[PDB]
């Protein structure tokens, strides 16, 4: 036996201006017969927290060349860390994906740094090894406090990316700090980008397991009804409706997943629709 | 360009008795320090059109790590061909994942064959790899075709695998022959297996396309009516329904999701349930 090799991919480190290490994994569609193959406009998609979720968005942008409605496919950008054993740094991203506020503990607040990054180091190094390709478009996807970071790009930076994805956004983070950044992106006066929202029905209400103790069932809904990921995620996109600044807002609650499983179906769709149903319908 | 690594994984090539060769890919726990770390009970799951899932089931059960109920993990083995810039082999798997009828076209009707050399040969080969480690309980997936092997498989040898899941299962290939042996299961007397069983909202009922026109989305719709992949499955679960032969049939539609972008969702589930929420209630 050997080890398992990942067609259509490759990896580089890249070093942010701080001098922390980035881990970046680039995968393109199955089809080409090598990188150089594409040539043209294809859209791109840049996923926080990269480590957790290559793999599955690279296989599940591979499994639509199969669906009619397939336009050529896009190209995958997993902005991760140096890892062993485990998909998440937790020091890392607990600065990275967090945004700056008077009251944020020690090793939180540096999502400006981290979007800098983005655009002035991890968008260019892509782009120099596709040179044959243009960006038509590129969304940013985050989980959890990725969630969060999309969020805060898209109010603080919001041209900075055309769609801005976020899955299960922990919006409770430091007193519902991300709120006064909404409330300020919607009263500036205004190409709008879009904004995809998406939470698990089992994260606010969650069901009890098997063999669990009521006491020990007790204190998981008492914590799910503290981080209230559901009616915060609808609290925010009531906010949001009408406003002339974003094209269009999609949100979904995916019946029957919590925070960890709901990360296979919402980076799926995430890719899914930015690829293939791109311009959104105007809502 | 450096490729991506795959982690805690390793492939081999195995024929059949006919001489034909399957790439069988197999992973474990992202936490493990090397593969001789699990000793003791597992539980295991087989995944036939291997190529198409096995990245996602891979890093879906590594991301259970990160989830409070996670209970150990368990290996994934997928089942696939060898292949370069496609996920399925279409002549193969029409032999491999289809039982025999006698209206069946040449090339189709292998389901037994295929079953046997993963019993035979696939199952011994992946238990000499951990020989430290027991096979706690076995699960067989499979999508589409590959979901019309699975109940294949449960109505007649369910004895062969603890859980049967089958994605989009289809029905329609032959449904006068796979309801013939799902009647033929239940009126037979009587540990019984679980099955799980599940499909897209929009597998049946698709939507239009942004700009798409009437005529190809008619078509579209009337495709979706032919293949009748809810109101089968519908059919075939309420059959089941009261079985004593069946410890639990759980049926899931899931909404917003079509034939393809379905596979990332009942995938997923799929594995996690098996390894984290065994044996399930009784239906």
Partial sequence: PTPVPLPNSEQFYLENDRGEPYLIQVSWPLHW???????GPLPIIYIVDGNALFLTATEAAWRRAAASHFAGG???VAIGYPLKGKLYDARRRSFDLTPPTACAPVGYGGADVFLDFIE??????????????????????????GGLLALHALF???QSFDCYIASSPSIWWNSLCILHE?????????????????????????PRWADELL??????????????????ALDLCAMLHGCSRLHALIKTEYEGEDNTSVMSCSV????????????????
């Fill in 74 to 76: 896009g190209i995958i």
């Fill in 215 to 232: 006491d020990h069932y007790e204190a998981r809904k008492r914590t799910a009804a503290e981080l209230r990921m559901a009616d915060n």
């Fill in 156 to 158: 603080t930076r919001p």
């Fill in 182 to 206: 909404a409330k300020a992106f919607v009263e500036t006066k205004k190409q709008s980008p879009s904004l995809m929202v998406s939470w698990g029905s089992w994260e606010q209400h969650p």
């Fill in 120 to 145: 002035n180091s991890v968008r260019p190094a892509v782009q120099a090894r596709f040179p044959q390709v243009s960006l038509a478009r590129e969304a940013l996807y985050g989980h959890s406090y």
């Fill in 33 to 39: 017969e090598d990188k150089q193959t594409g040539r």
């Fill in 268 to 283: 799926s769709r995430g890719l899914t629709m930015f690829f293939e149903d791109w311009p959104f319908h105007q809502s």
